[PDB]
Write a protein that binds this DNA or RNA. Structure first.
Ligand SMILES: [Zn+2]
Ligand SMILES: [Zn+2]
Ligand SMILES: [Zn+2]
Ligand SMILES: [Zn+2]
Length: 112
DNA sequence: ACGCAGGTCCTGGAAGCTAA
DNA sequence: TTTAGCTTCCAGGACCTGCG
């Protein structure tokens, strides 16, 4: 009997996580950047965005040393040092390291 | 041309914490 | 002391972009 959203009927760990999810249906962004004025849905997104203004890149690759202000961009980059390409085109067989690029490569097949 | 990869921010579960 | 509900943190992903 986890807290269930009345709109989309999905459930969450506690009532505070549901209240945070309520904003995905309303579009409310209550965390505003003081520098540029852009607003964000979560405080952790605002803290990440502020590091862009200040040039703070604490996330660095242990293999090549490339630095990132965004922890997900660093996590996404470090995978490239493994060379894995787990996404294969169903039409031509071209393999991609990222699903975003196969999505784009399926468009060129759609327009043939 | 188009594969490649970084920029940016949204979403939610995990974990840590406060206060009822 | 307990623990519901709060804040923080982290992993993943969507969408965009410019480069070689
Ligand atoms: Zn909902
Ligand atoms: Zn800003
Ligand atoms: Zn690297
Ligand atoms: Zn293809």
């Amino acid at each position: 009997s986890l807290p269930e959203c009345s709109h989309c009927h999905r459930k969450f760990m506690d009532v505070s996580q549901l209240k945070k999810h309520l904003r995905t249906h309303t579009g409310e962004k209550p965390f505003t950047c003081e520098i540029c004025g852009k607003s964000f849905t979560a405080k952790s997104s605002l803290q990440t965005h502020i590091r862009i203004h200040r040039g703070e890149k604490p996330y660095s690759c242990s293999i090549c040393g490339k630095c990132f202000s965004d922890s997900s961009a660093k996590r996404r980059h470090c995978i490239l040092h493994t060379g894995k390409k787990p996404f294969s085109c169903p039409e031509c067989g071209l393999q991609f390291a990222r699903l975003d690029n196969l999505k784009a490569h399926l468009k060129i097949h759609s327009k043939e």
